[PDB]
C-alpha cells in the first residue's frame, strides 16, 4: 500500500506537465532504445580474435 501510494504521487507530478511533454518523453525513449541496440552489436564482434 505504501509503494503504491508513492508511485502514484510521482506519476501525478509528471501528468501535470501536459500532453506535449508526454510526446517528448515517447520520442526520447525511442532514441535511447536505438543507442542501446547499436552498442550491443559492437560488443559481439570483438570476442572473435584469439
Amino acid at each position: 500500500k505504501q509503494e503504491l501510494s508513492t508511485s502514484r504521487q510521482i506519476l501525478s507530478s509528471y501528468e501535470f506537465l501536459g500532453p506535449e511533454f508526454e510526446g517528448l518523453v515517447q520520442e526520447y525513449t525511442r532514441l535511447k532504445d536505438k543507442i542501446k541496440d547499436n552498442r550491443w552489436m559492437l560488443q559481439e564482434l570483438s570476442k572473435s580474435l584469439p
Binding site: 507530478s13 511533454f21 517528448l24 532514441l31 535511447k32 559492437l42
Partner: protein, 57 residues
C-alpha cells in the same frame, strides 16, 4: 502496473527546454557511435609474437 509506467520518465528532467537539449545530445551520441564504427577496420593487426599466454577476462 504503476512501477512499469514510471520507468518511462526517470531519465528526463521535469523541464521541457532541458528535455529538447537531451534529445539533441542523444542524436549526436547516435552520430558519434556511427562514426567510431569507421576507421578501426584499416589498421589491422600487426606485431607480437610468441609463447604460452595464461591470462585474460
Amino acid at each position: 502496473a504503476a512501477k512499469e509506467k514510471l520507468n518511462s520518465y526517470l531519465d528526463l528532467a521535469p523541464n521541457p527546454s532541458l528535455v529538447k537539449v537531451k534529445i539533441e545530445e542523444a542524436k549526436r551520441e547516435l552520430k558519434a557511435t556511427e562514426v567510431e564504427l569507421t576507421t578501426k577496420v584499416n589498421m589491422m593487426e600487426f606485431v607480437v609474437p610468441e609463447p604460452s599466454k595464461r591470462r585474460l577476462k
